[PDB]
Amino acid sequence: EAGEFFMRAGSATVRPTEGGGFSVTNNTQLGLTFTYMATDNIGVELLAATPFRHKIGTRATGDIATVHHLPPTLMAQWYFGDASSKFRPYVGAGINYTTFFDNGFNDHGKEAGLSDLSLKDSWGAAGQVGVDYLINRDWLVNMSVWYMDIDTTANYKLGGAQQHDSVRLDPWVFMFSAGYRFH
């Protein structure tokens, strides 16, 4: 597999970790991954996706603002078994980068006096465990479980300027996908 380059396309579901309430909704997007096989086990993977849309809310108010973000992640991977194996599970470690954007309070949020919402970027440790089933020499199916440190702060104006709340997304990411190989 050394020298190989493959791409996976599939769904990438993001399940944040418990951010009244103040909770963040789950969300699935088109997840694409680009991996380069350093040497039959070591590979470099890049995770990309369509922009994620999340909702924020108190069980008292219901949704009150919606958020968007790109969580690109770079990872060093270890593929168990040899090139010849057709069932190659793997573990990976790397760094994450999330960029929030196009964030805003609902009408109801506004009603409650919320305004001007924005979130600062994030960087963090990231790890994964997943398996690639190599059907043909050109195709594979795949599952993957990621975990990323995605801590960030929200700045808004509740009536005046109570704009400082930390948000700990620390999401678990699941990805079911198929992939094509370019030797």
Interface residues with ligand LDA (CB under 6 A) are 22, 24, 56, 58, 61, 65, 67, 112, 114, 117, 154, 156, 158, 165, 167
Determine phi and psi for 110, rounding to 5 degrees: -45, -50
* Minimum distance from residue 89 beta carbon to ligand C8E (Å): 9
Instruction: Please identify, using beta-carbon distances, which residue of 56 and 134 lies nearer to ligand LDA.
Output: 56
**Nearest residue (CB) to ligand C8E, 24 versus 114:** 24
Minimum distance from residue 57 beta carbon to ligand LDA (Å):
8
- Pick the closer one to ligand LDA by CB: 24 or 175: 24
Residue that the structure tokens 């960029």 belong to: 99
Q: Which is nearer to ligand LDA, 18 or 82 (CB)?
A: 18
Work out how close the CB of 125 gets to ligand LDA at its nearest, in angstroms, rounded to a whole number: 19
- The residues of the shown chain that bind ligand C8E, judged by CB under 6 A, are 9-11, 13, 28, 32, 42, 48, 50, 76-78, 93-95, 123, 125, 133, 135, 141, 174, 176-178
Alpha-carbon span 159 to 145, nearest angstrom: 41
3-class SS at 21? coil
Is the sign of the CA dihedral 33, 36, 42, 46 positive or negative? Answer: negative
- Rounded CA separation 124/89 (Å): 24
Name the residue with tokens 């997840």: 31
Q: What is the DSSP string of 42-97?
A: EEEEEEEESPEEEEEEETTTEEEEEEEEE--EEEEEEE-S-TT-SEEEEEEEEEEE
User: Pick from ligand C8E, ligand LDA, none: which does 83 bind, CB < 5 to 8 A by kind?
Assistant: none
- Least distance from ligand LDA to the Cβ atom of residue 165, Å: 6
**In sequence order, which residues have a C-beta less than 8 Å from that of residue 110 and are 6 or more positions away?**
none
Residue 164 Cβ, how far from ligand LDA at the closest point, in Å?
A: 10
CB nearer to ligand C8E: pick between 94 and 171 = 94
